[PDB]
Amino acid sequence: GYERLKEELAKAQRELKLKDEECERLSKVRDQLGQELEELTASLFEEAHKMVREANIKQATAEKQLKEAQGKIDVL
């Protein structure tokens, strides 16, 4: 098995070699996809907060307006 090992080692050498090349290709589009999901979600979060903040900024100065009057009732 000299021509069998000299031949097959060419197949199975190319084998890892094909996948090697196939590996960098598959991991490449995973990174590329991940970055697009990074920024998509970066945006969703930003806004998701942005909204909620304003929901709270108002609950803030309405209840703050209330403590401006609610303490002067309790004071007397």
């Binding site: 996809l33 991940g34 907060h49 709270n56």
Partner: protein
């Protein structure tokens, strides 16, 4: 226009180490509301200046749930600096810091900048992890370590600025 850099950062660790406050203090929010509890992800932006330039920091805070396993890898894989965060009030958090270091090594990139953040250092009276023993972990793994208090507001801003300097100095090296 401005900024003129974008560092992507990640906060990782055991739940209840206070990863999430540590963030909320850096990003300067007036409020408590977060999705960490319920979803397991949250996110914050802050630009800072370092030696004159604008640097946009995108900070992801991950909480492990297996629910979003894939997405959170995407954050690991794409992260420029990741902060490992334990509670000095709690050992296993500290013990696990090794475990995470696995993930970081296994899920994340080969040159990533890394920083062990010993959190809640202000509450000394409930302190189970010695700092000295904290630094040794870090030095063993050749990574920076820092004790922190999201609540006393100790070293959080410094922890980040330090990690941000470490990211930039590395990139400026590839001029």
């Amino acid at each position: 226009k401005t900024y003129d850099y974008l560092f992507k950062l990640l906060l990782i660790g055991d739940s209840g180490v206070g990863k999430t406050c540590v963030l909320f203090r850096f990003s300067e929010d007036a409020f408590n509301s977060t999705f960490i509890s319920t979803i397991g992800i949250d996110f914050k932006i802050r630009t800072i200046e370092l030696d004159g330039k604008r640097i946009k920091l995108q900070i992801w805070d991950t909480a492990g749930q297996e629910r979003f396993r894939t997405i959170t890898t995407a954050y690991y894989r794409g992260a420029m600096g990741i902060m490992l965060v334990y509670d000095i009030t709690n050992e296993k958090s500290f013990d696990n810091i090794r475990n995470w270091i696995r993930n970081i090594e296994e899920h994340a990139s080969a040159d990533v900048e890394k920083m062990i953040l010993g959190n809640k250092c202000d509450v000394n009276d409930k302190r189970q992890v010695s700092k000295e023993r904290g630094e040794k972990l870090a030095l063993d793994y050749g990574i920076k370590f820092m004790e922190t208090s999201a609540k006393a507001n100790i070293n959080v801003e410094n922890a980040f600025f330090t990690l941000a300097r470490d990211i930039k100095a590395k990139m400026d090296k590839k001029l």
